[PDB]
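Request from the bench team (R.T.):
"We need a structural guess for the complex before ordering more nitrite ion. Sequence and SMILES attached. Just send the tokens back."

Command: build protein-nitrite ion structure.
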Amino acid sequence: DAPQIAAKGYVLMDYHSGKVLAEKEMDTKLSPASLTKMMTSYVIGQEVKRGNISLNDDVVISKNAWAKNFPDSSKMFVEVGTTVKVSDLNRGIIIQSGNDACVAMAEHVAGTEDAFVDLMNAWASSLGMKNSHFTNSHGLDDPNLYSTPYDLALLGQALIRDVPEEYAIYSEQKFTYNGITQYNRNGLLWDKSMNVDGIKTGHTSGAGYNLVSSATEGNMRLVAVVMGTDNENARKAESKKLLSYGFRFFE
Ligand SMILES: O=N[O-]
Ligand SMILES: O=N[O-]
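Reply to R.T.: structure attached below.
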């Protein structure tokens, strides 16, 4: 008896087999918003593993990455004409959810945001995200930027599976850049009763708060996606319920 989850859509997936244990509106399209950053970090993770970029490179911060372009949204607080290290931009993306850092990495990886988006969709396709399409590296709204809870689950799973060095970064609780400290918004990282080590948080303006989470217990690993909860407390509680049910499902 799957429990009731106060969310517009969700999916709970066994990480090992990829089997869906429970779901609601699993394949219905939504605006993923800041969860789009998981795809950005996925592409960055592949580039780092293959050696096309190094964590020690100095990245140019262009006009397009200027903090000035992202008023009202989360930022790492990067400045034009300076350089920032790849590892630092990565954490800005993952921990701080900084849109500025997304654009800077996009450019460092593929020259322009558009080409970076080409790599994002080519990876989405090879991962089996058949109901997803990206238009930018950060998630700000666009009619053609969409995904689904199920696809987002595949993405979370792929992060843990294919880019572990990138995935480890999702359990870091905070990050400081330029004397500005920001916390990882995934509150489940602080829960002592559970071993939640990811993944990413976000908000979709007409729907609500979202969370893509993963946790382990014994030899089990689950990936859960909850979309459209009414507030940050519900985002945590409903994800925790979803996950506990999965741990109990295998019994
Ligand atoms: O802690 N998640 O809102
Ligand atoms: O079969 N152990 O998750």
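Two things stood out. The helical segments are 36-49, 86-94, 99-110, 113-126, 149-162, 164-167, 232-249. The first strand starts at residue 9 and ends at 14.
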